[PDB]
Q: What sequence folds into this?
């Protein structure tokens, strides 16, 4: 399988970033969603796991 | 008096020569238009020349390049005339946005793209107008943004690609998350093709009209929402008591600006 790996040049860009070399998705028929605010509010002290952790550091693109 | 009547007749002859130059404007024959612009008063009739250039840009799309060439020549002659032309273009773009007319806003966007393409107006106001057109979901706004992208894809690539990425994200969200018809999907596909090609067939820089040097020309950041001055007071002639000194200054400004076969 073809390694579609994008080489970044400048470090000013974020590590996760939509490159212009990638073709755009251009996404353009209903989903089985639950009722809006009928029940199930989240309890206290639940969160995404790494909320305090940043998404990317300076070493992420180099790694 | 006789002096005011002579000044009014000279202003009418200058306006008639400007209208004859704008009507007979050609891409290969822009030197005759430049000589007709230099024959009349360029400083005293700068507002009349800007009004004639705006009328030629609004009347036909083929004369928009000649109007951009005249605006670039006026900006290279003096930065105040180019700043007044950019402020008038920004006020026309704001009037076309507020009036909710598709054709007037399309003509104002084409004139703004021609003025930014002629290095006479700043691209920050055009980028803000493109961001305002992208933030408002409409078919006419998307068509005006696609026309501005097809007019100045080279300028958008040389200025900022983050605005193009935001426009692509807004078009993707318009196609799925917002309501998109067949014409809206066609406009989104045209915007995607303009962003992918980068307007290589029709670039921002236009040949045969760019006869004004960019070193003597200045760029003015005149916003559309700001109180832009059209500078139309100098378009109509007035009985100046110091009109002889103004005529001498205009004459001085026009003088300064001009064997093996055997082997």
A:
């Amino acid at each position: 399988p073809n390694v579609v790996f994008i080489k970044t040049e400048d470090p000013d860009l974020p590590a996760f970033y939509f490159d212009p070399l990638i073709n755009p998705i251009s996404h353009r028929s209903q989903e089985p969603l639950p009722d809006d605010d009928e029940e199930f509010e989240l309890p206290e002290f639940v969160e995404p796991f790494l909320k305090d952790t940043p998404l990317y550091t300076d070493n992420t693109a180099n790694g | 008096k006789n002096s005011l009547a002579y000044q009014r007749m000279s202003w009418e002859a200058l306006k008639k020569s400007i209208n004859g130059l704008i009507n007979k404007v050609n891409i290969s024959n822009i030197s005759i238009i430049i000589q007709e612009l230099l024959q009349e008063n360029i400083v005293r009739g700068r507002g009349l020349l800007s009004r004639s250039v705006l009328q030629a840009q609004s009347a036909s799309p083929i004369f928009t390049h000649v109007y951009a060439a005249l605006v670039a020549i006026i900006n290279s002659k003096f930065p105040q005339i180019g700043e007044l032309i950019l402020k008038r273009l920004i006020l026309n773009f704001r009037k076309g946005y507020r009036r909710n007319d598709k054709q007037l806003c399309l003509t104002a966007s084409k004139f703004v793209a021609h003025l930014i393409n002629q290095n006479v107006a700043h691209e920050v106001l055009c980028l803000e107008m493109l961001t305002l057109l992208l933030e408002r979901p409409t078919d006419d706004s998307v068509e005006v943004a696609i026309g501005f992208l097809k007019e100045c894809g080279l300028k958008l690539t040389q200025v900022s690609p983050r605005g193009i990425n935001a426009i692509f994200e807004r078009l993707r969200n318009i196609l799925h998350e917002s309501e998109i018809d067949k014409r809206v999907q066609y406009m989104i596909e045209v915007m995607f093709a303009v962003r992918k090609d980068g307007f290589k067939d029709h670039p921002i820089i236009l040949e045969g009209l760019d006869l004004v040097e960019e070193d003597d020309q200045f760029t003015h950041m005149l916003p559309l929402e700001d109180d832009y001055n059209p500078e139309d007071v100098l378009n109509v002639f007035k009985m100046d008591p110091n009109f002889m000194e103004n005529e001498e200054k205009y004459k001085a400004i026009k003088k300064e600006i001009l064997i093996n076969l055997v082997s």
Chain A touches chain B through eight residues (CB under 8 Å). Residues 18 and 24 of chain A are 9 Å apart (CA to CA).
